[PDB]
Amino acid sequence: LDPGLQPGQFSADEAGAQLFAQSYQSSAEQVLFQSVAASWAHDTNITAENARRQEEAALLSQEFAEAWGQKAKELYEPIWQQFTDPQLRRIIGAVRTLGSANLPLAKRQQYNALLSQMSRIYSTAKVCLPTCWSLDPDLTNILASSRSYAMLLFAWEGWHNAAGIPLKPLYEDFTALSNEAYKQDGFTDTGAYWRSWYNSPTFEDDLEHLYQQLEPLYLNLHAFVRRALHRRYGDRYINLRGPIPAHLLGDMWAQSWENIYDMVVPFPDKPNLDVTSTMLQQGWQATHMFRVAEEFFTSLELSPMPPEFWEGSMLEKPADGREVVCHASAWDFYNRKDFRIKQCTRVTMDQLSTVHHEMGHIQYYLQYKDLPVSLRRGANPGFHEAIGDVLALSVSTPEHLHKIGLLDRVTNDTESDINYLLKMALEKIAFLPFGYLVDQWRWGVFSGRTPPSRYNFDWWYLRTKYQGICPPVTRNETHFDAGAKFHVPNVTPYIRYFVSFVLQFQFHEALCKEAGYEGPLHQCDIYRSTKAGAKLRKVLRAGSSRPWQEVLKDMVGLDALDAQPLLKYFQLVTQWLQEQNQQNGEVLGWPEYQWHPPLPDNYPEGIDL
Ligand SMILES: *[C@@H]1O[C@H](CO[C@@H]2O[C@@H](C)[C@@H](O)[C@@H](O)[C@@H]2O)[C@@H](O)[C@H](O)[C@H]1NC(C)=O
Numbered sequence: 290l291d292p293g294l295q296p297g298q299f300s301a302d303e304a305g306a307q308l309f310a311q312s313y314q315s316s317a318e319q320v321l322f323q324s325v326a327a328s329w330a331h332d333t334n335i336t337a338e339n340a341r342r343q344e345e346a347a348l349l350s351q352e353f354a355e356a357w358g359q360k361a362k363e364l365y366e367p368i369w370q371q372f373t374d375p376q377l378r379r380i381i382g383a384v385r386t387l388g389s390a391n392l393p394l395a396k397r398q399q400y401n402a403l404l405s406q407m408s409r410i411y412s413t414a415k416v417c418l419p420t421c422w423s424l425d426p427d428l429t430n431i432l433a434s435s436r437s438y439a440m441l442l443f444a445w446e447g448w449h450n451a452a453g454i455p456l457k458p459l460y461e462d463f464t465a466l467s468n469e470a471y472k473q474d475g476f477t478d479t480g481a482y483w484r485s486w487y488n489s490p491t492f493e494d495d496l497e498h499l500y501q502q503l504e505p506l507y508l509n510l511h512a513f514v515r516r517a518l519h520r521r522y523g524d525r526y527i528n529l530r531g532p533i534p535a536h537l538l539g540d541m542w543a544q545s546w547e548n549i550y551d552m553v554v555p556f557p558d559k560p561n562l563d564v565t566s567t568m569l570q571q572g573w574q575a576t577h578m579f580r581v582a583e584e585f586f587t588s589l590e591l592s593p594m595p596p597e598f599w600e601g602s603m604l605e606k607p608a609d610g611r612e613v614v615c616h617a618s619a620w621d622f623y624n625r626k627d628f629r630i631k632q633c634t635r636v637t638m639d640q641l642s643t644v645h646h647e648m649g650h651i652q653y654y655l656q657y658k659d660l661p662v663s664l665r666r667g668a669n670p671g672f673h674e675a676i677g678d679v680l681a682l683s684v685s686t687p688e689h690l691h692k693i694g695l696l697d698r699v700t701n702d703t704e705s706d707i708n709y710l711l712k713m714a715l716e717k718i719a720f721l722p723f724g725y726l727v728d729q730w731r732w733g734v735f736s737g738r739t740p741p742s743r744y745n746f747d748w749w750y751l752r753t754k755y756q757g758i759c760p761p762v763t764r765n766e767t768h769f770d771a772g773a774k775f776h777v778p779n780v781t782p783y784i785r786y787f788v789s790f791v792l793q794f795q796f797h798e799a800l801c802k803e804a805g806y807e808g809p810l811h812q813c814d815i816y817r818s819t820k821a822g823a824k825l826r827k828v829l830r831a832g833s834s835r836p837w838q839e840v841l842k843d844m845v846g847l848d849a850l851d852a853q854p855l856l857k858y859f860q861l862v863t864q865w866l867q868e869q870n871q872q873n874g875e876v877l878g879w880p881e882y883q884w885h886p887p888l889p890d891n892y893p894e895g896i897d898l
Pocket residue numbers: 763764765766767
């Protein structure tokens with residue numbers, strides 16, 4: 290390790306630890322920069338050479354973590370836990386947690402290479418024909434817009450087989466090394482480490498209690514959408530008492546259903562709330578979508594995006610033949626200057642939402658960039674994922690869309706309310722079972738409850754139990770369908786999105802009240818409210834300097850996750866769906882749990898290109 294980056298000498302007392310922490314932070318800045326820069330060069334240009342460079346930067350990061358953690362142990366291990374300063378307790382407790390730096394050199398190298406290779410496999414996989422299709426944009430476009438049973442099947446099967454099958458042996462090796470690493474920090478397994486970020490003894494029980502409250506809304510949305518699908522695909526491919534085939538819901542993972550709005554919309558002669566065709570008619574591009582998102586942030590007196598953001602970001606998929614990680618992300622270089630998005634932006638209404646999601650992450654980085662590096666994080670990971678989604682709730686209202694020239698016609702009547710709440714339910718309520726189940730699967734893999742011999746059997750148990758879907762072709766343990774979802778090979782934790790989907794409605798309700806808005810919660814738009822801005826700004830500036838339960842209390846009046854704001858927002862549509870399903874004679878749930886659809890005639894030969 291460079292002489293400049295090694296730990297010096299400090300006294301073995303709380304006062305010494307104060308000096309240790311400040312010195313620790315001043316070094317960490319330079320090591321973080323080199324890591325993030327190498328990661329950017331690879332994720333925007335996947336090559337064997339750029340992987341080698343990123344692995345070399347990762348190794349340096351591990352060498353730094355080891356040197357500083359050992360010093361914390363040497364000086365503090367028997368005393369830091371009784372330190373008078375809560376904040377200090379927080380940094381020393383982190384510094385003595387070595388993670389992958391606990392591995393011996395040869396295994397550290399093995400671990401870093403596995404990360405590179407899993408990322409490559411996912412982001413470069415394609416589906417070839419009898420020139421090959423990428424996930425983004427080509428397969429994503431098919432799953433969103435095709436109403437051909439056989440074309441949808443070709444895309445879902447091609448993707449799952451191409452991405453998932455080769456990942457399995459690498460994912461087994463990654464799991465074992467990750468657990469060996471975190472075990473030496475005193476965690477039972479890696480999942481116990483990930484859950485410890487919420488600092489709550491009752492986390493899994495509290496999540497289980499939230500889901501019991503939300504499940505009836507999901508079951509009612511599921512039954513009404515199954516019926517709408519039946520009226521299009523017919524009795525051969527839809528069983529009104531069984532699971533829905535996993536490729537027909539608008540999305541490769543069936544995780545949100547807004548792309549099948551046209552098939553589900555209750556009252557089709559009210560205003561058309563999907564504005565994608567208007568964006569295309571008006572000639573919107575990626576640069577327009579980013580500028581319009583920026584202007585929502587400045588309307589609240591939050592920060593614009595700096596020159597370095599515009600000069601360095603990647604806002605469209607490269608047209609030069611580079612392979613890239615298309616799944617969107619926001620980057621803090623840890624130098625208080627360089628902040629960037631990398632998104633393969635397409636011109637659609639759901640992508641405008643995604644732009645706001647990413648720009649939320651940037652705004653958090655701008656607001657806490659002056660805190661010590663160890664505290665440049667969200668209050669918990671759910672808070673970081675929620676910020677942009679909250680502003681997108683306001684943007685998507687019919688009233689806001691009118692203000693920005695995306696929806697000419699204005700109506701305020703009960704049918705128009707039901708259309709809007711149903712469209713928002715397809716986006717937010719359909720996701721809840723998926724946002725809950727992903728880390729239940731992964732926690733069972735890290736604990737050993739799910740060995741490699743049961744990866745796919747236990748994935749499909751969960752997908753059917755929670756989402757009420759079935760795979761549309763037969764699967765066995767050579768398939769690794771969890772591996773065909775970004776966050777699994779890219780080692781990104783998922784329970785943050787279930788947390789975020791609950792939190793965002795808590796935050797929206799609080800900001801709408803601070804704005805002085807007095808109408809129905811689902812019609813609030815906080816645009817141009819400088820008072821809502823100031824309240825959100827207090828959250829962002831806090832970083833991880835204070836317990837999330839306290840930050841939440843200051844913001845919304847309660848110190849806990851709470852489903853009541855979500856239920857209040859959806860109340861009218863919750864009642865309407867329950868009455869429609871009863872009048873229609875639906876069965877709620879999927880009692881014919883063994884059912885799978887038949888194959889199309891001639892499959893796969895009878896599809897044009
Ligand atoms: C598992 O499946 C492999 C791929 O075969 C395809 O998927 C299976 C589920 C069947 O539908 C089969 O008709 C398909 O062509 C098979 O190659 C394999 O031999 C099956 N068994 C094992 C152990 O992989």
